[PDB]
């Protein structure tokens, strides 16, 4: 492995606060940053009939979720990673998968 921080979320304008600002700490602030960035957004798509009984003209609804995914890289910091990560914990339903 290397140090790979991934960020996943259910909406945009959530990810951007975490990534695109508040990984500031590793950016130009103290140490090197190699920044790759963002990945295929996936769609989770659940088609569902609209009538609670059997009648009608056979209408439907389609519902959707969006996933959002991000990814950034650091070249062996030796427990500066503690600092860098911990400052943004922010926004409900953003999760942070550090490797």
């Amino acid at each position: 492995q290397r140090v790979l921080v991934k960020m996943t979320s259910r909406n945009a304008k959530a990810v951007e606060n975490v990534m695109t600002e508040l990984l500031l700490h590793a950016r130009n602030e103290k140490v090197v940053l190699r920044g790759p960035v963002r990945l295929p957004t996936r769609t989770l798509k659940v088609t569902t009939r609209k009538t609670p009984c059997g009648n009608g003209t056979n209408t439907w609804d389609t519902y959707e979720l969006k996933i959002y995914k991000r990814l950034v890289e650091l070249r062996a910091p030796t427990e500066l990673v503690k600092k860098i990560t911990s400052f943004p914990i922010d926004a409900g339903v953003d999760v942070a998968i550090t490797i």
């Binding site: 996943t8 979720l65 339903v93």
Partner: protein, 200 residues
């Protein structure tokens, strides 16, 4: 993953539900769920705190416990909070609760309806509506509606200015619908769907 999301989703559903139902007449409105790593912070947003929190904290600690046994948290990985959301008029859910309570206690139709619509439009709401269906007069149901101010009903901009709520009132000789709408003076941040404006 695809899965982590759905976990958070189904969680948030069940959570919401159990509070909405079993905690009544406090003007329950919303929650929020979030995590900081290795904690869970769930706030609760209801008009009247002194009922929520209990006399010395019995009620809040109660809820805590309930949750922990279901979703299999340890203590100190779950903590709950209360908040007053003041300006009661500008929540659908709040006024839906209140209106329900009165109809269950054998108040009329039009009297009860009006009383809501007052308190709403005094809070500064752009317009509101209220509906009641079900029994009234006797036989063949009936539906009636009461309207004040103005509101939009199309687009996706009535899904960001108008949040609604629907509840039941269980009575003898019929169930009875009730519903309350309420268009806000504000968005969820800011946005106006039309209305071009010239700033000199």
């Amino acid at each position: 993953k695809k899965r982590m999301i759905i976990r958070d989703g189904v969680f948030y559903a069940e959570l919401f539900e159990f509070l909405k139902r079993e905690l009544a007449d406090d003007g329950f409105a919303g929650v929020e769920h979030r995590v900081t790593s290795t904690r869970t912070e769930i706030v609760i947003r209801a008009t009247k705190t002194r009922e929520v929190l209990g006399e010395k904290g019995r009620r809040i600690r109660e809820l805590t416990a309930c949750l922990q046994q279901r979703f299999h948290y340890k203590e100190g990985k779950l903590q709950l909070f209360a908040e007053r959301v003041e300006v009661r008029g500008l929540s659908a859910m709040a006024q839906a609760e209140s209106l329900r309570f009165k109809l269950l206690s054998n108040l009329q139709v039009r009297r009860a309806a009006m009383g809501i619509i007052r308190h709403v439009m005094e809070s500064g709401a752009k317009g509101c509506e209220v509906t009641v269906g079900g029994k009234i007069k006797g036989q063949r149901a009936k539906s009636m509606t009461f309207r004040d101010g103005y509101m939009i009903k199309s687009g996706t901009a009535h899904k960001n200015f108008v949040d609604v709520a629907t509840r039941h009132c269980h009575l003898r000789a019929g169930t009875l619908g009730v519903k309350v709408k309420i268009m806000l003076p504000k968005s969820m941040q800011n946005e106006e769907e039309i209305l071009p404006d010239v700033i000199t």
